From a paper:
UdgX excises uracil from uracil-containing DNA to concurrently form a covalent bond with the resulting AP-DNA. Structurally, UdgX is highly similar to family-4 UDGs (F4-UDGs). However, UdgX is unique in possessing a flexible R-loop (105KRRIH109). Our earlier studies allowed us to propose a reaction mechanism of UdgX, which involves the formation of a covalent bond between H109 of UdgX with the C1′ position of the target deoxyribose sugar concurrently with the uracil excision from this site in DNA.
To evaluate this in more detail, we generated a Q53A mutant wherein the motif A of MsmUdgX was changed to GEAPG to correspond to the motif A of family 4 UDGs. Subsequently, we incorporated the Q53A mutation with the H109S mutant to investigate its role in a surrogate assay of uracil excision (with turnover). The Q53A mutation in the H109S mutant increased its uracil excision activity. Further, the kinetic parameters of uracil excision showed an increase of >2-fold in the Kcat/Km of the double mutant. When compared with the structure of UdgX (wild type), the hydrogen bonding interactions observed between Q53 with N of K97 and O of K110 were lost in H109S/Q53A double mutant due to the absence of Gln side chain in the mutant. This would likely change the positioning of the R-Loop near the active site, leading to an increase in the activity of the H109S/Q53A double mutant, compared to the H109S single mutation. Taken together, these observations suggest that the evolution of Q53 in UdgX (from A53/G53 in family 4 UDGs) disfavours uracil excision activity. Further, as shown by the uracil excision activity of the H109S/Q53A double mutant, the evolution of Q53 (from A or G in family 4 UDGs), appears also to dampen the uracil excision activity. The Q53A mutant supports that UdgX specific evolution of Q53 occurred essentially to stabilize the R-loop conformation.
Residue numbers in the entry: 2 to 207
The structure:
């Protein structure tokens, strides 16, 4: 089912990334430029999972390279976390999108639960390969992939969670997605940025 038959029997991240370029586990590979796999190494203690590559990631071939990734950089820096010692990835690896007339970018479209279940084999291979001590789930889509489709990120902020069905029983911290911190009132944004730094420190202190 899904991407599972496209996942090779290997923990090498480069072999997995190359294989993900050939994945047809769902329909998202057709309109996307390429598959966006995770960045970082197997020594990483912290795995971070977003929703999906955006417009910038789709053509950069790397995760979190747009404005959201730059805000995440500022949050990681304030939390004293070396990005090079992370493994950063997304719940689904193909960019889902539409264009609006007058647009300045391709608009990110939300992955269905079906596409998240289809791409999960890659996330399982990534966690199996990295064996992280803690997984940071950035946003509702990533959190639900591991904690259940009914999970609410807003109701468990800053909580160290552990679910049994998860490879390696790593600690899980669900937090806001950095793209949510790009817009809104300045005081709401600044308060929300501090909440993200707090959650990143909890994950680093696991
Ligand atoms: S989104 Fe995931 S499951 Fe769907 S085609 Fe891309 S890699 Fe395969």
């Amino acid at each position: 089912a899904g991407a599972q038959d496209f996942v090779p029997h290997t923990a090498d991240l480069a072999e997995l990334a190359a294989a993900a370029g050939e994945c047809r586990g769902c329909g998202l590979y057709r309109d996307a430029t390429q598959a966006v796999f995770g960045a970082g190494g197997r020594s990483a203690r912290i795995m971070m999972i977003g929703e999906a590559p955006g417009d910038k990631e789709d053509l950069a071939g790397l995760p979190f390279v747009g404005p959201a990734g730059r805000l995440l950089d500022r949050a990681l820096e304030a939390a004293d976390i070396d990005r090079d010692a992370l493994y950063v990835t997304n719940a689904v690896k193909h960019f889902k999108f539409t264009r609006a007339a007058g647009g300045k970018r391709r608009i990110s479209k939300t992955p269905s639960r079906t596409e998240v279940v289809a791409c999960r084999p890659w996330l399982i291979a990534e966690m199996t390969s990295v064996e992280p001590d803690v997984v940071v789930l950035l946003g509702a889509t990533a959190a639900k992939a591991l904690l259940g489709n009914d999970f609410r990120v807003t109701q468990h902020r800053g909580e160290v969670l552990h679910v049994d069905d998860v490879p390696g029983d790593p600690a899980l911290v669900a937090t806001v997605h950095p793209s949510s911190l790009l817009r809104g009132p300045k005081e709401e944004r600044e308060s929300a940025f501090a909440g993200l730094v707090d959650d990143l420190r909890v994950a680093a202190d696991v």
